[PDB]
């Protein structure tokens, strides 16, 4: 609710968007926007919200569901900066473990989504406060539909660019399992790869997780 | 004795060779090329005989020393295809530790000599029968001067060409130690690297030993 990611006319940009998205929502009959309950601006973006029981999770605009309450009742969702308004969203839990106890801080991660409509590639996204023997969890978004998830690929890219940087051997760490919950079709799939290539390390080639279970 | 690297004229290429290396003995007075005492062909392959005591590592050619023996004295060396006939014998011993017990066979390696002098960049050589736990010894030579040694690359390389080849991860070993014996000045310097890099995979980049005493 502060901003919308499109900003005379643009002096009224984010002013209009609450009659694009109904409008939106009016042509769109099939397809619903689904908007999600959680408790804090600063908690929906850790993805510890995503949970559609108990009058919780409703839909965005006219197909929406008539549901009283007893108190205020604050809810979240993303978009997108055009005419089709819908996004998915992805809940992504990590487990870190290794042997060298050392902290990091503001790493850059890049992660894959491969399905079995279509496949997305390079989405990116930061975790501050890296360390071993933690666990650790987030919100990802994407635009092309996916339907059930295969794989997963998960690379953490290099800051440094010059030709020294291939050596001063780069830290790493012993990636296991990753836990993958759905946003709208509630399915708590497991990933993890095989008894090789189970060790991430930055700017060398990304693991390559498949369904585990 | 078996052969020379050179082969009407090229019919008696390997007859001539008897006079070319003592007309070249005769030139470079300065520079002598010795020739070192072992007990059989298969032995000097693998460097187990580099040792200069005791009425060892005589000399070849005009300025030879007159030492005599109780029983028939075969001695060795090798040459070069060209006018100058002497090449440097390195003797080098490597440590192999890990942890995985898999045994390989006629892996190749390539190997680098950085020195004061000059540098010796892309010498092959192989060794069949790698596992953990064990002490391989070879011989090594080459054609340019290097003076003292300073550092040592080592690599091992690959043998798949595909894009294919970048997965199903590669085997690797943990090496700490290499011994280097040189063959005229009897040096015989320890060489270790620090406490990262040090993991040898093959297909990989190459570790870098520095002296280390």
């Known amino acids: 609710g502060t901003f919308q990611p499109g900003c005379d006319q643009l002096v009224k940009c984010s002013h209009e968007r609450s009659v694009h998205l109904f409008i939106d929502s009016l042509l769109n009959e ?36 008539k549901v009283r309450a007893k108190r205020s009742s604050k809810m979240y969702l993303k978009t997108r900066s055009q005419m089709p308004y819908k996004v998915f969203h ?15 801080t503001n790493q850059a991660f890049e992660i894959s989504l491969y399905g079995t409509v279509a496949e997305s590639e ?16 987030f919100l990802l978004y994407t635009e092309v539909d996916i339907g059930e998830l295969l794989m997963l690929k998960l690379k953490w890219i290099s800051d440094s660019y010059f030709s020294w940087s291939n050596w001063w051997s780069s830290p790493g760490f012993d990636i296991g399992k990753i836990r993958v919950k759905a946003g709208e079709t509630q399915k708590k799939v497991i990933f993890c790869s095989r008894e090789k290539m189970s060790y991430l390390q930055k700017g060398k080639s990304p693991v390559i997780f498949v369904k585990c279970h």
Chains 1, 2 share one sequence.
């Open 30 to 65: 099939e397809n619903p926007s689904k908007a999600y309950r959680c408790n804090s601006k600063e908690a929906f973006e850790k993805g510890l919200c995503l949970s559609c029981r108990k009058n919780r999770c409703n839909n965005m605009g006219y197909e929406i569901n």
């Open 90 to 104: 992805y809940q992504v839990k990590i487990h870190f473990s290794g042997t060298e106890s050392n902290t990091y």
């Open 122 to 137: 390079n989405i990116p996204f930061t975790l501050p406060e890296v360390s071993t023997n933690k666990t650790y969890s």
